[PDB]
Paper text:
The eukaryotic guided entry of tail-anchored proteins (GET) pathway mediates the biogenesis of tail-anchored (TA) membrane proteins at the endoplasmic reticulum. In the cytosol, the Get3 chaperone captures the TA protein substrate and delivers it to the Get1/Get2 membrane protein complex (GET insertase), which then inserts the substrate via a membrane-embedded hydrophilic groove. Within the membrane targeting stages of the GET pathway, the homodimeric ATPase Get3 (also called TRC40 in metazoans) adopts closed and open conformations in response to nucleotide load and interactions with other pathway components, allowing binding and release of the TA protein respectively. However, the cryo-EM structures and native mass spectrometry of hsGet1/Get2 and scGet1/Get2 show they form a 2:2 heterotetramer, which is stabilised by Get3 and interfacial lipid binding and is important for efficient TA protein insertion.
As the Get3 TABD helices α4 and α5 are not resolved in the hsGet2ΔN/Δα3’-Get1/Get3 cryo-EM structure, we bound E. coli purified hsGet3 to the hsGet1-CD in the absence of nucleotide and solved the crystal structure of this complex to 2.8 Å resolution. Surprisingly, the structure showed a heterodimer, despite multi-angle light scattering (MALS) confirming the hsGet3/Get1-CD complex was present in solution as the expected heterotetramer. This indicates that dissociation of the hsGet3 homodimer occurred during crystallisation, as previously observed for scGet39. The interfacial zinc ion is accordingly absent in the electron density, asserting that zinc coordination is important for dimerisation. There are otherwise only minor rearrangements of structural elements found at the dimer interface within the hsGet2ΔN-Get1/Get3 cryo-EM structures, indicating the hsGet3 fold is independent of oligomeric state. In the crystal structure, the hsGet1-CD contacts the hsGet3 monomer via the more extensive interface I rather than the smaller interface II (classified previously for scGet3/Get1-CD complexes). In the hsGet3/Get1-CD crystal structure, helices α4 and α5 of the hsGet3 TABD are unambiguously in the same conformation as in the cryo-EM structure of the ctGet1/Get2/Get3 complex (as in state 1), rather than the alternative conformation present within the hsGet2ΔN-Get1/Get3 structure where α4 and α5 are reorientated by ~90° and 180° respectively (as in state 2). Therefore, the hsGet3 TABD can adopt either state 1 or state 2, with the latter correlated with interactions with helix α3’ and/or the hsGet1-CD via interface II. Indeed, within both the structures of the hsGet3/Get1-CD heterodimer and ctGET insertase, Get3 helix α7 is tilted inwards at least as far as the position of hsGet2 helix α3’ in the wild type human GET insertase structure. This suggests that binding of helix α3’ pushes this helix within the TABD outwards, which could contribute to the further rearrangements of α4 and α5.
Residue numbers in the entry:
A (entry chain B): 39 to 104
B (entry chain A): 7 to 115, 122 to 347
């Protein structure tokens, strides 16, 4: 019941919806739509990965204490 | 913080497709590093040369560094070149060179010290990423000490150009390995010299070699991330595979925070009512499809179009012709 969990759930859900839409796009005929969608996916994935690494660093701080 | 959003005041101007020229490059007087990459062969090389020729008019002195394994730069200018930069015929400001794919740092720019150097280079061989970056760094140190107003890179269509654009990061990470290799070679050097050759002087060498090149590397790193000082120009053709690799290149440039805002689409065919050609009409149909996709997706770029020159056109003249079509858009062949 924390925001960092809720944020990840929403980001993962939105990334999955975007990937589901990208499966519809033909890369050859409508390349611009495919590219713009892939850019949004990569941006949101990099954001999610930075958030996950931050929470992983907090876990290491607790699990393997300094 | 306190200012008005400035979009309240006069609504918003409408999106104007950017001019299909490279004049924005010329007007950027702050640019000192200009990379010309993308997947291209003769076209990419001729584009980079034409860019240099037009840059020399408004600048003080311009350099041409060609890391392309193919020596198409020497071919196009009708003059051969080498590592030492030479003046180009008919131009006072132009200077150009051709660096090897191995970057020509196999020989760095007593015999015991030579042996210690050979040991260093041989141990560095086991790490081609760090060794390639060190050879990039030696080249950049030479060109920086040369103190030119702007340099243009005719880069290779491979991923080694991406490595060149991240060579300060590779060096910064590889410092540990370099110190380890130095720590394992130095005592042997010192021991060998003392025990058998009396002199110990050779041990002091190579100590301050890394104490002043590193600030230069850090300055270049700070300089590449600056859009005002560094920009990438992508060369491609209006086919799917080329468009796909172009988008991948732009994405990886964004990752490295290297700016790009100019694209060059060459080898474009324009059907002429005189001298008809059906295969040109089909190639034009394909090119039109993907050039519309490009003008939709790359609205934030200067999309400079270049027509496929007839095969007879070669040498400095095609360079001269391109040097104009990069500043004035080509006119349709409809008489």
């Amino acid at each position: 019941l924390q925001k960092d969990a809720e944020q990840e759930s929403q980001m993962r859900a939105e990334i999955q919806d975007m990937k589901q839409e990208l499966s519809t796009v033909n890369m050859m005929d409508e390349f611009a739509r495919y590219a713009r969608l892939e850019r949004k996916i990569n941006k949101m994935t990099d954001k999610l990965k930075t958030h996950v690494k931050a929470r992983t660093a907090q876990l290491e701080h607790h699990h393997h204490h300094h | 913080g306190w200012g008005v959003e400035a979009e309240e005041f006069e609504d918003a101007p409408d999106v104007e497709p950017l001019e299909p020229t490279l004049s924005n490059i010329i007007e950027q007087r702050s640019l000192k590093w200009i990379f010309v990459g993308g997947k291209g062969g003769v076209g990419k090389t001729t584009c980079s040369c034409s860019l240099a020729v037009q840059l020399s008019k408004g600048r003080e002195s311009v350099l041409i560094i060609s890391t392309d394994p193919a020596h198409n730069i020497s071919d196009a200018f009708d003059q051969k070149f080498s590592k030492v930069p030479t003046k180009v015929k008919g131009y006072d400001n132009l200077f150009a060179m051709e660096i090897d794919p191995s970057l020509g740092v196999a020989e760095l720019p007593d015999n015991m010290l030579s042996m210690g150097k050979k040991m260093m280079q041989e141990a560095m061989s086991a790490f081609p990423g760090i060794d390639e970056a060190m050879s990039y760094a030696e080249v950049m140190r030479l060109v920086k000490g040369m103190n030119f107003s702007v340099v243009v890179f005719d880069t290779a269509p491979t991923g080694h150009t991406l490595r060149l654009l991240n060579f300060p990061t590779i060096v910064e990470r590889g410092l540990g390995r370099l110190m380890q290799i130095k720590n394992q070679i130095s005592p042997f050097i010192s021991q060998m010299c003392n025990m058998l050759g009396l002199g110990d002087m050779n041990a002091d060498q190579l100590a301050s070699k890394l104490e002043e090149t590193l600030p230069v590397i850090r300055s270049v790193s700070e300089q590449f991330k600056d859009p005002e000082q560094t920009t990438f120009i992508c060369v491609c053709i209006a086919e799917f595979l080329s468009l796909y690799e172009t988008e991948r290149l732009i994405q990886e440039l964004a990752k490295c925070k290297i700016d790009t805002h100019n694209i060059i689409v060459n080898q474009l065919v324009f059907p002429d009512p005189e001298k008809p050609c059906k295969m040109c009409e089909a190639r034009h149909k394909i090119q039109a499809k993907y050039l519309d996709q490009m003008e939709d997706l790359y609205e934030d770029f200067h999309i400079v179009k270049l027509p496929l020159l007839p095969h007879e056109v070669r040498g400095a003249d095609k360079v001269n012709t391109f040097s104009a079509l990069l500043l004035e858009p080509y006119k349709p062949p409809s008489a």
